[model samples]
Target: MEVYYTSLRCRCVQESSVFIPRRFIDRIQILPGCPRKEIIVWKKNKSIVCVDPQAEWIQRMMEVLRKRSSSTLPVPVFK
Candidate 1:
């Protein structure tokens, strides 16, 4: 099976979604105008979720994550 592995850093306790790795973008094929993309994320177990690549909050969070230095928890992804 093909998989993409990455990690996520802890944000505020109120945040509901995790940051999607930029590298994953290059690996997957995305078409224009799609608001959300379905992906399989491995937490303690297994679950499928959708991510919004165009969300303003997510974009800002991505910037914050990219600028800060912190220890991230490892995660596995299946495309």
Candidate 2:
């Protein structure tokens, strides 16, 4: 099975290409070399709020993916 991970842009003007996978969040938080400065509120309405690492690598990935239109390449999938 595969999942289509939609992209998102942060308030800091950085874009996350692949919505941070649940399993990778902790790893990203602990990695010293990762560019994420601080976890910020991603979404908030009334009862729920979400946060994720904001990093430069995410934006870089967005740029790379953006250049290749979806129709021009095969949809990426996981095995």
Candidate 3:
């Protein structure tokens, strides 16, 4: 299995490919608003994001998580 990897936007490719690897990724998490629409090109950090996502970035980052409570469970809300 491939290990750690790097990603960059399409325009960033030719220059950055020197730094980015094509494989070694277990799964590429496509950023929400990737411009190229190619999942692999969206670097985990530099890709699109809302200025205010509901969860604290750090809180979500440090832990393993499920997106919601359960498959049968309704969406969650904070008071």
Candidate 4:
């Protein structure tokens, strides 16, 4: 699914589109990402980890896609 976020403070709007199998999160047993307190709190951190080779989830997800196992960023299509 595509997501759009507009920040008044930043006065900007941006979006990202990623493709994954329908219900992939459920298939993997991880709930869809949420805007919960835990996430909000973590987001408050000044730093974020992205494409960190040592990160377990990132590495695992990459491996899954590399092996053509199951799960991956879907094609981004815009109309």
Give candidates' CA RMSD values in order.
16.5, 14.9, 13.2, 15.3
lDDT of 4 by residue, 8-38 (tens): 4321133222333322332221211333111
- Maximum-lDDT candidate: 1
Worst 10 residues of 1 by lDDT: 7-16
Q: CA lDDT of 79 in candidate 1?
A: 94
Q: Residue 55: error of model 1 in Å?
A: 0.6
Candidate 3 error regions (>4 Å): 1-25, 41-79
Query: How much is the lDDT of residue 30 in candidate 3?
Result: 33
lDDT of candidate 1 at residue 67, scale 0 to 100: 70
- Among all candidates shown, the one with the greatest TM-score: 1
Clashes of 4: 1
| Per-residue error (Å), model 3, residue 24 | 8.1
Ranking by lDDT: 1, 2, 3, 4
Q: How many residue-pair clashes does candidate 1 contain?
A: 0
Give the alpha carbon lDDT tens digit for every residue of 1-79 in model 3. Answer: 1222245543222222123332322333333422432234334455422212222432353232344334558778998
Whole-model lDDT values for every prediction: 0.40, 0.37, 0.33, 0.32
Which of 1 and 3 is the better model by TM-score? Answer: 1
Q: Estimate each model's TM-score.
A: 0.29, 0.24, 0.18, 0.24
Off by over 4 Å in 2: 1-54, 70-79
Candidate 4 global CA lDDT score: 0.32
